[PDB]
Amino acid sequence: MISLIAALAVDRVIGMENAMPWNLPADLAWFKRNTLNKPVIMGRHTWESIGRPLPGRKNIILSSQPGTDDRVTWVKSVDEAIAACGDVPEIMVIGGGRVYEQFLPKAQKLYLTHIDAEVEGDTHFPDYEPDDWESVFSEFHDADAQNSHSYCFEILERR
Ligand SMILES: NC(=O)c1ccc[n+]([C@@H]2O[C@H](COP(=O)([O-])OP(=O)(O)OC[C@H]3O[C@@H](n4cnc5c(N)ncnc54)[C@H](OP(=O)(O)O)[C@@H]3O)[C@@H](O)[C@H]2O)c1
Ligand SMILES: Nc1nc(=O)c2nc(CNc3ccc(C(=O)N[C@@H](CCC(=O)O)C(=O)O)cc3)cnc2[nH]1
Ligand SMILES: [Mn+2]
Ligand SMILES: [Mn+2]
């Protein structure tokens, strides 16, 4: 199955200047828990934003140009990215905006974090059709001394 995972601020903002404009330790822990031991597909700008390979995961980077780092796998099309994952139960697509748009029609599950933060951004999660999706899990958390915003973890499944 293909799944997307993302953290969204207000108005579906996901990034600004090739970075994320918040620091939510609890959300990165959720990201790690839901991606470890799975392949992760990302676009080249997200690869540069993370800045290093993610441990315990097969890292697959989409770019139209040849690769520049043999610690990760480089592919040149969506279909090649999927194939490079081979025969696993669940493929995690970890962004960014352009990559999420291309994989959304192919996805069966969304792992969304809704963050109560107002930030200017330059990248948005796609504007998906809510009627297509069933919420199967939601868990709200208030802000605390480690996490400066409230946030809600949600899992949706395609109906
Ligand atoms: N909040 C979140 O959960 C989250 C998650 C991930 C990323 N982000 C943010 O998202 C932003 C980056 O997103 P973005 O939309 O600018 O970029 P992106 O989707 O990460 O990367 C786009 C690049 O991927 C390559 N690519 C995409 N589709 C391709 C295809 N079909 N075939 C070949 N190459 C393909 C191209 O690289 P080439 O130009 O080399 O061809 C393209 O320029 C950053 O701000 C980052 O912090 C946020
Ligand atoms: N829910 C969610 N939150 C995010 O912040 C997120 N970020 C990306 C892409 N950017 C990043 C940036 C950093 C790390 C990162 O350093 N992760 C470590 C955290 C380890 C920990 O908290 O102990 C990792 O091992 O996954 C992951 C993805 C994609 N989907 C997301 N999805
Ligand atoms: Mn806030
Ligand atoms: Mn919902």
In words, what does this structure look like?
By secondary structure, this protein is of the alpha/beta class. It has a single domain, classed as Dihydrofolate Reductase, subunit A. The chain has four helices and ten strands; from the N terminus they run E-E-H-E-H-E-E-H-E-H-E-E-E-E. The structure holds NADP nicotinamide-adenine-dinucleotide phosphate (NAP), folic acid and manganese (II) ion (MN) (2 copies). NADP nicotinamide-adenine-dinucleotide phosphate binds next to strand 1, strand 2, strand 3, helix 2 and helix 4.
Keywords:
Dihydrofolate Reductase, subunit A, 8-stranded mixed β-sheet, 159 residues, binds folic acid, monomer, 10 strands, two-stranded antiparallel ribbon, binds manganese (II) ion, 4 helices, binds NADP nicotinamide-adenine-dinucleotide phosphate, alpha/beta
Helix-strand blueprint:
Elements: E1 2-8, E2 13-15, H1 25-35, E3 40-43, H2 44-50, E4 59-62, E5 73-75, H3 78-85, E6 91-93, H4 97-103, E7 109-115, E8 123-124, E9 133-141, E10 151-158
Parallel strand pairs: 1-6, 1-7, 3-4, 3-6, 4-5
Antiparallel strand pairs: 2-8, 7-10, 9-10
The chain binds NADP nicotinamide-adenine-dinucleotide phosphate, folic acid and manganese (II) ion (2 copies).
Number of domains: 1
| Beta-strand share of residues | 25-35%
Overall geometry comes to globular
Largest sheet: 8 strands, mixed
Summarize the structure.
The chain is an alpha/beta fold. It is built from 4 helices and 10 strands, in the order ββαβαββαβαββββ. Bound molecules: NADP nicotinamide-adenine-dinucleotide phosphate, folic acid and manganese (II) ion (2 copies).
